[PDB]
Amino acid sequence: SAVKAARYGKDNVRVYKVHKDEKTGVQTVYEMTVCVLLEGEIETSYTKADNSVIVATDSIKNTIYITAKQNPVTPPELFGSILGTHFIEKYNHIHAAHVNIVCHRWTRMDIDGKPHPHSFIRDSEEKRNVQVDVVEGKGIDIKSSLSGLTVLKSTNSQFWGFLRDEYTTLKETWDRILSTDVDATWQWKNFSGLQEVRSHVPKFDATWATAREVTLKTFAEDNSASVQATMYKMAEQILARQQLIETVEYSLPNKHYFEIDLSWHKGLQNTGKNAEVFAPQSDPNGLIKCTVGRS
Amino acid sequence: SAVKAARYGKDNVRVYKVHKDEKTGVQTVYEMTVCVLLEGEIETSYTKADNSVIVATDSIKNTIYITAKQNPVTPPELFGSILGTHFIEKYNHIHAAHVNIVCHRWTRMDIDGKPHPHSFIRDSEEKRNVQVDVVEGKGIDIKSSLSGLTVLKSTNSQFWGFLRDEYTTLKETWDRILSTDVDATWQWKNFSGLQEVRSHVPKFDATWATAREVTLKTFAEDNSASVQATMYKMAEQILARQQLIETVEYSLPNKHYFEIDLSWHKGLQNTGKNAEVFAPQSDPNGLIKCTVGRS
Amino acid sequence: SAVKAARYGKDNVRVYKVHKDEKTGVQTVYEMTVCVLLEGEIETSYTKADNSVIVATDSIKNTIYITAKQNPVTPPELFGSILGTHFIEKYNHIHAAHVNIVCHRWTRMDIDGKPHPHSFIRDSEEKRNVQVDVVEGKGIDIKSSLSGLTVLKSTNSQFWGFLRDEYTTLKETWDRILSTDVDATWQWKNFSGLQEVRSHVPKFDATWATAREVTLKTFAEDNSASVQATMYKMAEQILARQQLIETVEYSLPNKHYFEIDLSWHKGLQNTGKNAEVFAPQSDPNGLIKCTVGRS
Amino acid sequence: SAVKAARYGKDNVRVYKVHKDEKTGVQTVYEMTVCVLLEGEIETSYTKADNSVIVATDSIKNTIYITAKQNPVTPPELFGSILGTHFIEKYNHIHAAHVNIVCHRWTRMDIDGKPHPHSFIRDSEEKRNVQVDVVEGKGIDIKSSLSGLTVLKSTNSQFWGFLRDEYTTLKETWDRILSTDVDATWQWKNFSGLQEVRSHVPKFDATWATAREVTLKTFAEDNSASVQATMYKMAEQILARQQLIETVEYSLPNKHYFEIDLSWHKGLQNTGKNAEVFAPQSDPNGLIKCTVGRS
């Protein structure tokens, strides 16, 4: 036997940071969950108990806090690039750093219609994420995403025209509920290193904003032919609005809402145009995925 | 042996309802999770396999959908009162109905600054709940709550002056992070039946709004002496703004955020007035509770 | 307004303890999650920012570790009694201590058919729990339970004879799947204090063993008429086997497994006596509860 | 823009199956959660609302139940191969089927020391899984795994000799707790189709048994130098015991258990050789991974 691949590090490192404007007194908070996995010349830790090649995961954790203390933690694309670059430059034998960041929402509260200087609400469980891969001699690969964005439209979704054979029982519909949890990923052109990542810093928050905005508008306004058709329209538009992105990926569950036939009860009409009350189904769920790039 | 208490029913009934304005075309959605437990002359089901006294839980489920079809599902206080009253009036031997409702958020989206007629976002995992107990000959007891309201303030929380003995290591602080998940419950004066519950329908949404508003404002503006001191101020105010409430209960975890001493690293200053980066602690957590009533 | 009730403390305190036999070299591990809530003369912390009456939750946490260091942590009934007694005796103004313990499974592994001296497996997520209430001048009230015990029988469950009216669609059945998650609670006669709790220490592990044994055997062998009928038989038997118990409570979900009609597909027979493949339903679920005492 | 990749299907399909021996009366149950994702000539569903190419996810679900009715569901390697082969052979334009199966434990109960014919316990949340990829013209690729196998040893784990620099605070240790959740994956040599998968059916249960057995024994008996060193020994051995496996992957969290210094309390000794009580840490956690193949 032989080691064919190996990576190790620290997962589920919770990190909070506050910025305090000494002038205005306005404070701002950031909270993330960070994972850093390293690869490089570490096989001997596995095959011969050689721990000299191991940067202890506890030191990785300390390094995450130290880097957050010494650098901006926003946008997460930048912070993860700084953190992965640190490990491949500090440690001669570490050749790749894989950094995942989950950003948690802390939205400033409005009290009496005015923004509060230091009080915040988790207005939703939606996350903003990055996957930053810093590879020696291969630059910096960033995938940005939003996830846990849960939406529903009560009409203006259709699904008809699908294959029908002896395994098919689904009825065609011209009017149904569509609900999903949006997982949207935009993959950035390769960056040569930290200077290039820094040089594009504004595009990270802009592009996240755009992806979110396009996702919500397209969802709301598309008279959807299918989840497949609607997500492609989302991906297309994002691609057309930020040239530094190479691909857009969607992963969307179809969170089904079933009609309930109550006709058995005093002739009640609750189906088709008369449908008012529905049974949300926890499982199973369709799962629809696509990666869209440039023609 | 003897049966000393017994209740049974259907739990985790997911229910969606849509309202469609035929005029404006504006649609509105409601989604809840409903539990209905019955008590009454049912002991023989337990002691002698007498299932004649059992309203099957499947029929309870059908009844929930049927009642949602035939009645408003909002405010949840009303819907749960209608549902519990149904069981104690329909079934001579059923003498109490315990109804719990969890209302899920489906907030109308704004697209291009204007409200969409049929698209919605789960803007947060915060819930609005009711516990409605309909008891034959004892009226209707309603407890309303909000839960999962997650908040943080980065300053203007203190904790000093607490008991110190040989078990104490906590340092007094004059400036700390305070974060919690708000579980707030207001308990309504007894209602004689469904007519009285209906007669006060507007107060249910008003009072939920108030509790939420008071919770957030007090949290944001109180230079907090403790979680205990701050929650009492919240409870007091709600009591003073709605006379039909008899008590207000809070259950608040103290979700600790620990300073991180980095002085061991190149003399870095990250404590006290220099604290920027903190470690959010998943567990353990203080848990602070109180029930406040009228003097 | 006035404080009507108040309690506070530390929740979700994870605790591990190891015992090392210096002789045999056999080690044994215990792992729990502990919550301690205190009540007493603490209202002023809420109404006037008087933190002098507060035993900080951090000190409560230290006290849990200190007590586990100085005392056996098993059986949990004993450990929780020692811990609650500590707070009401140490602090003149603390008059009640509410202690909840969740015991996690660490079962010794058998390697090559022989018990290993220091390696363990979480053989299941089933828990053993206690709720110990130590109240000044009111002794010690203990409720013991097992929970998360997940079981299924594929036959020898029936449900017929239940009420049928216009809300009923459930078909009677003489052969169905029954699956549940057992939550079983035995409530001990009041104990005058720690000496009496100690005097009965053997009965705690014995009685837990019995409840589990009776639960599983009755479940397996009862040709069940209903969940109601089967759980009562369990409760009865436990009551008859340990006289120091006053009541036995069960809370049992009916985790439904639905038949799937495939007759629409090449005449396939999958219902009634031909049922092989079923759809386990995550929600909703019947919920059946009872408390049985002595006639 | 252009579709670069696309797959869709049904996720979280719960499936139960019972086998009933008409002779002995012994019944046996199987329960899984199945996901089937298809790829092929489906891009037009995304780009032009062409649903003709879509096998509805609801039909995929029906097909899962139908296949479970018509075929053995065990070993899961076989069942997933049958299911993926069905889709690529039935549908000319579907060219790959990705099938994931999670098998849930239903272990036969022993009542009074004898195996019960139809009653079962979820003895643990550990799962047995398969990932079966059926690709037209590329055979069948199977990855088998076990996951959620939670273990702890109280001694005979060490960690010393790791890199130390200005970011390091971890103390070397010669005696620590090691606990993890085992995720172990063995990847099978490519299979040409269903006949070859069938021809090796016995090796699937045998090899799962072996991997589990090796995992537990190595964990228990290795005086571990690191998680890295111990997992490699596990992977090596499995590779040496089943030649049809090409690689073995482990993903292991280091679920830390921290010593608690109580020396501040009456000089209590709870560290090093005196350590009895520890604080299990929920997060963060080291994460150690490796893929081992043949030299």
Ligand SMILES: O=c1[nH]c(=O)c2nn[nH]c2[nH]1
């Ligand atoms: O077994 C271990 N491996 C590591 O890489 C590590 N880092 N900290 N502690 C550790 N323990």
Ligand SMILES: O=c1[nH]c(=O)c2nn[nH]c2[nH]1
């Ligand atoms: O055992 C059962 N008890 C009930 O109350 C019930 N209702 N539906 N199915 C049921 N099964």
Ligand SMILES: O=c1[nH]c(=O)c2nn[nH]c2[nH]1
């Ligand atoms: O607000 C607080 N209340 C308490 O009871 C406490 N104990 N520790 N920290 C605390 N903070």
Ligand SMILES: O=c1[nH]c(=O)c2nn[nH]c2[nH]1
């Ligand atoms: O939008 C949809 N896409 C699908 O592939 C599908 N299959 N069933 N329902 C569906 N709805």
Ligand code: NA
């Ligand atoms: Na390097």
Ligand code: NA
């Ligand atoms: Na009645």
Ligand code: NA
């Ligand atoms: Na006292």
Ligand code: NA
């Ligand atoms: Na094909």
